[PDB]
């Protein structure tokens, strides 16, 4: 909506992005969070003893 | 590994990185050149190439 100011929404999305980063980094169990992996090789695979 | 346009499943022996690095293996990216044999890394394990 063009009549709505975009700055307030700007810090709203900034706070939401910080929240997303906190979700991504905090959600871990024992060092293997299964998220925020290193994609230098692009084929990281994690396994569970079945 | 797909030999042709169609995919397929293959079984190949895996070699530990410690075994390669113990015998004086040159490395570059995902390549190993311990001796005459050449090893590459596919996802996490080194296999003969």
Curated annotation (Swiss-Prot), chain B:
Lineage top rank: taxon: Bacteria
Spans through the membrane: none
Subcellular localization: Secreted; Bacterial flagellum
Function as written in the Swiss-Prot or TrEMBL entry: Flagellin is the subunit protein which polymerizes to form the filaments of bacterial flagella. Homomer of FlaA is able to form a functional filament.
Protein family according to the UniProt entry: Belongs to the bacterial flagellin family.
Protein name, as recorded: Flagellin A
Organism of provenance: Rhizobium meliloti (Ensifer meliloti)
Lineage: Bacteria, Pseudomonadati, Pseudomonadota, Alphaproteobacteria, Hyphomicrobiales
Shown part of the complete sequence: 199 to 247 of 395
């Amino acid at each position: 909506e063009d009549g709505v100011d975009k700055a307030k929404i700007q810090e709203e999305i900034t706070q939401l992005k910080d929240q997303l980063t906190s979700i991504a980094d905090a959600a871990s169990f024992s060092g293997e969070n299964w998220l925020q992996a290193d994609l230098s090789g692009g084929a990281v695979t994690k396994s569970v003893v079945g | 590994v797909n030999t042709n346009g169609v995919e397929s499943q293959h079984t190949v022996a895996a070699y530990s990185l410690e075994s390669l690095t113990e015998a004086g293996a040159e490395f570059q990216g995902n390549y190993a050149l311990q001796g005459g044999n050449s090893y590459v890394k596919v996802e996490n394990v080194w296999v003969r190439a």
